[PDB]
Amino acid sequence: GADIEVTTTIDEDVDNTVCSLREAVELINKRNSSDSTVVASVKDGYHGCGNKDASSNIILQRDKEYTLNSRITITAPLTISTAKNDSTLVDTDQPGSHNATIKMAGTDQLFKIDDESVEKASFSVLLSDLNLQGAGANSKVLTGGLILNHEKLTIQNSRLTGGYANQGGVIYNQGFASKSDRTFGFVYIVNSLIQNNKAAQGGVIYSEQPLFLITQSVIRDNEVSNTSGSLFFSQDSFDDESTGEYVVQRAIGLSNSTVFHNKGGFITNVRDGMFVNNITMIKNDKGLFLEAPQGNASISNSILVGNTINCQANSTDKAIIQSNLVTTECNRNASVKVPNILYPANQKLIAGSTDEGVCDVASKDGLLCPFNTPKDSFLGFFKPRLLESYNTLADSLIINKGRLYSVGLASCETLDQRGKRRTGYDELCDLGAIEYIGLNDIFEAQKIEW
Amino acid sequence: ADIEVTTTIDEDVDNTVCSLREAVELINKRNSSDSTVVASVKDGYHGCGNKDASSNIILQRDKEYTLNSRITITAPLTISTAKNVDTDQPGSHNATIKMAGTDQLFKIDDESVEKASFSVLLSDLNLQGAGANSKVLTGGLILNHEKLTIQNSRLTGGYANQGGVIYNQGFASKSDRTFGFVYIVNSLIQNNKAAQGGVIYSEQPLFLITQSVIRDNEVSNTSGSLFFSQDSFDDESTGEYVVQRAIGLSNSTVFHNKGGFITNVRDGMFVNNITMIKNDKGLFLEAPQGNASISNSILVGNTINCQANSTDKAIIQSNLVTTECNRNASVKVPNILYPANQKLIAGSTDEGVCDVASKDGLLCPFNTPKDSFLGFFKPRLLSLIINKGRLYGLASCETLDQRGKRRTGYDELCDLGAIEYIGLNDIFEAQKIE
Ligand SMILES: [Mg+2]
Ligand SMILES: [Mg+2]
Ligand SMILES: [Mg+2]
């Protein structure tokens, strides 16, 4: 049926003619109630949010800001997204430039997602094309600065900012995973910008077990104040003998993501069952903390240099690190068939002197362009450089150094951070979050000449 | 008169017998705002007569009432066992509510956004959950969103993912008066299990357990707690709560529990005059403001007695402690150090007959007198706990002990733990000199 379009930007639950975001969620919660009188109470709507065969899709208007004075509790599957324009019209606007904003005006988290139904467990929630802004420095949140989650949470095409808490700056993810514990929270984030989030532990995500997957995203300017902690922190390991299947499945970890300028502790603590593939992790305080003692973790096809601490291992760890651009710090447990690419001492990582800015095509050194967001892209990245000092592609430390065979646990991703397909010509791919595709640097070098 | 349940089976069928489910439905429908639903129960509901029937549901002594799925309570009511003057052991004739399926026993919630919470009383009952056959996720016995009071009862067999006995929903504020609050008095909590919140999983610390026994429970997450609160109160309210002693644990015996901690002490909570011995893990301290008080308790004999996070400032005064629970910042009301070589219990086991002719045991083994519903560890006259508290001030003794006996003056002194030593039974039974 019809989607629920929120018709006021204020935070309210008052029976009147307008529909608020809180009321739109409360409508979907009540239609999902196990009490027949509650379901019948919202047969024709709830306090301004019309119903009568309405969908579970909540629509927010483009370029509008919706304020919350306290948390919204979600007890039923639903989606919240920004209204989409006509696709048959010329849309040259930059992606994500018209996202609706959900803004915390108080000191609370934005959402709590949980369920207390007799069976009928683990529903899904989709947050799409939204600007989620937390309380920031005014936050009083203990766990989950933006969201406390116990369900199947997917966030896409979104900005995640201002999530401050003691544990889990963006998300605190509850729940343990086993054959008997089937009601656990899981976090899936794709094509999103994660910035300005802080926590004492789990600066971005604090999860009780490795139950998150971050792909095609930018992670910048976040902090975990415990310098031994992590931005994506797993409190406990899995109950053994199951991690050998999780890693080959590549269901938990980080992929196709650019991670730079983060502060304090590590990006993530790599436990058994987790994987890291095709990420660009540079210019951070700390990179990867390795504690996969069974050897059921995989780190591949990534750029893991230019951080104050690139890798650091716990007392027992056997994480398989292969086909990465690394220094000696991260050259651990590498196989002879899939070795890492060692980072030479005399190697300049970024062209020019700025970590972020316009790239100088007429620069003879520098593996990567500075960070930049093209006008046709939501997220920015460090584009690999095809230098003139490369007689062949074998001279590059990044380009065509991976293998694109779900084969061998060292295969590149099918896509890159931008969502573009990695062609896999000659079964080869580029290290890091970005596959080299367009050759405008070569075109421009001919025009600048003479 | 009260609503008398006249069958032990579970049903909602229009016939000649009144079931517990139909007795609750009668009260729910009478409280409805729909005048047609109210009229449908004008002359009773499906066998439960309703002409002079109140909101008190009565179950028969020594009878077991089976539920095959949960009952949803949406209206104020009480459930209790019929009375009888009476010299039997208290609680020996309780009616039993037993889950025969895989569900929780009760969901207590009208699901109203605006309406303030209503009151439900469960008195003199044996509540037994599905146990190993449970499929419950939240609230092995009760999913609560209202003002739930449980007294004189047994709470056993509650198995769930969150909240072995009770899952308590709600946040407390002047603009949100729909929060649930659990008040448990003179009850036995035993053989319950959860991944988090082995007994109570609560969103905020909205519970007070007093004069009760907590034994043989488990929270499988070794970082979790039996009485677990997921969130904290507002910083501005914790100062009042700790002084008023609104939420926490008092006058209770806690032993033989497994897995994680007994409770995670957040700001606003208090612990006073408990005997917390022989557990896997004791208290987890999590009060960064310093607005939490732990006093007059016995906090030794557990594998882990206390453990705090980096920022905890919980006030720990006048307790029997080891290194983990001791604080050098308590100079005026210090704790008492428990020696290692001393035997905690003057007996061969943790439960059974007390060894009267001894000078090495601080407490008698756990024993239930025949004139009492709950048992306890009675102190012995030898010293480390007798007259070590002050009646009198966050460190004041409770006015009563677990048994409801008054802790007398005794030069403004009281005994640490859940039991006040009153009778000189130790000294009289030393007549064995032959
Ligand atoms: Mg309205
Ligand atoms: Mg009947
Ligand atoms: Mg209510």
Residue numbers in the entry:
A (entry chain A): 2 to 406, 411 to 455
B (entry chain B): 3 to 86, 91 to 388, 397 to 406, 413 to 454
Please give me the paper's original passages concerning this structure.
X-ray structures for macrocycle-bound myeloid cell leukemia 1, γ-aminobutyric acid type A receptor-associated protein and RbtA complexes match closely with the computational models, with a Cα root-mean-square deviation < 1.5 Å to the design models. Among the four targets tested here, binders for MCL1 and MDM2 have helical motifs, binders for GABARAP have a β-sheet topology and binders for RbtA sample looplike conformations that make extensive contacts with the flat surface of this target.
We designed macrocycles against Rhombotarget A (RbtA), a recently identified cell surface protein from the ESKAPE pathogen, Acinetobacter baumannii. We expressed the Avi-tagged version of the RbtA N-terminal domain (residues 20–458) and used it for binding screens using SPR. To confirm the structures of RbtA and RBB_D10 and the binding mode between them, we determined the high-resolution X-ray crystal structure of apo and macrocycle-bound RbtA using X-ray crystallography at 2 Å and 2.6 Å resolution, respectively.
